[PDB]
Design an enzyme around this catalytic site. Structure first.
Site, PDB file in Angstrom:
ATOM      1  N   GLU A 176     106.768 119.543  44.027  1.00  0.00           N
ATOM      2  CA  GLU A 176     105.956 118.328  44.241  1.00  0.00           C
ATOM      3  C   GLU A 176     104.578 118.718  44.757  1.00  0.00           C
ATOM      4  O   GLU A 176     103.559 118.172  44.338  1.00  0.00           O
ATOM      5  CB  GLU A 176     106.675 117.362  45.170  1.00  0.00           C
ATOM      6  CG  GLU A 176     105.797 116.187  45.538  1.00  0.00           C
ATOM      7  CD  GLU A 176     105.325 115.378  44.359  1.00  0.00           C
ATOM      8  OE1 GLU A 176     104.243 114.736  44.493  1.00  0.00           O
ATOM      9  OE2 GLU A 176     106.081 115.276  43.331  1.00  0.00           O
ATOM     10  N   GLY A 211     105.353 111.884  45.092  1.00  0.00           N
ATOM     11  CA  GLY A 211     104.278 111.837  46.087  1.00  0.00           C
ATOM     12  C   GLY A 211     104.526 112.819  47.218  1.00  0.00           C
ATOM     13  O   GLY A 211     105.706 113.059  47.628  1.00  0.00           O
TER      14      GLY A 211
END
Ligand SMILES: Cc1[nH]c(C(=O)Nc2nc3cc(O)c(C(=O)O)cc3s2)c(Cl)c1Cl
Length: 192
Positions: free
Chosen positions: A34, A93
């Protein structure tokens, strides 16, 4: 502030749902992916040319990019830095990585200044602060995965990170990606 703490709590309550299996190493390595994906987004936008991924000796991982730097100015609604909003408000995110990290260090180089902030389980320890001057730009995130979330496979596997970073270098041929393992001195440089 109450909304931010509740959103972080939502991720911690059901962490596999946001990051992937928290017992078989999948979620653990997806934490790195991520953060790297945000650096890749900055490369896709035409700003980042180099990404350095470091497995520290204490099994934290850092990702450094040479992009624009996350914005640091106060975000009016929340009364805190834009960077803090990005790091704390729910590609899952970076706020998911922060929520699932016992500690996270953020260093931003932007508009002639270095800025630093520390979080613990997604809670900022102080407002983002200026630590010095710089001519460089970019974003560094170092995180220590929470052992309350990640079980069994808790140590990063160099080869799992190396394979994904090689894939991303091939698909983003202009980008230089370095991988460094401070546990044993191993390093790789992927640049198609
Ligand atoms: C390693 C890592 N790198 C990043 C990153 O560079 N994100 C960024 N997001 C923005 C958003 C913006 O609006 C602007 C701007 O307007 O100048 C700049 C940046 S840079 C993240 Cl997020 C993480 Cl994590």
């Amino acid at each position: 502030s109450i909304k931010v703490l509740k959103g972080l709590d939502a991720v911690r309550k059901r962490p596999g749902m946001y990051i992937g299996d928290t017992d078989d190493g999948t979620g653990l390595h997806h934490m790195v992916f991520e953060v790297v994906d945000n650096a890749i987004d900055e490369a896709l936008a035409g700003h980042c040319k180099e990404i350095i991924v470091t497995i520290h000796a204490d099994n934290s991982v850092s990702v450094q990019d040479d992009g624009r730097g996350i914005p640091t100015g106060i975000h009016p609604e929340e009364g805190v830095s834009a960077a803090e909003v990005i790091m704390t408000v729910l590609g899952v995110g970076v706020s998911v990585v922060n929520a699932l990290s016992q500690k996270l260090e953020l260093v931003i180089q932007r508009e002639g200044k270095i800025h630093r902030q520390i979080y613990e389980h997604g809670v900022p320890q102080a407002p983002l602060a200026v630590t010095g001057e710089t001519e460089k730009t970019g974003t560094m995130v170092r995180f220590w995965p929470s052992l309350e979330t990640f079980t069994n496979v808790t140590e990063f596997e160099y080869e799992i990170l190396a394979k994904r970073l090689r894939e991303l270098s091939f698909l983003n041929s202009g980008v230089s990606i370095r991988l460094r393992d401070k546990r044993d001195g191993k390093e790789d440089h992927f640049h198609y």
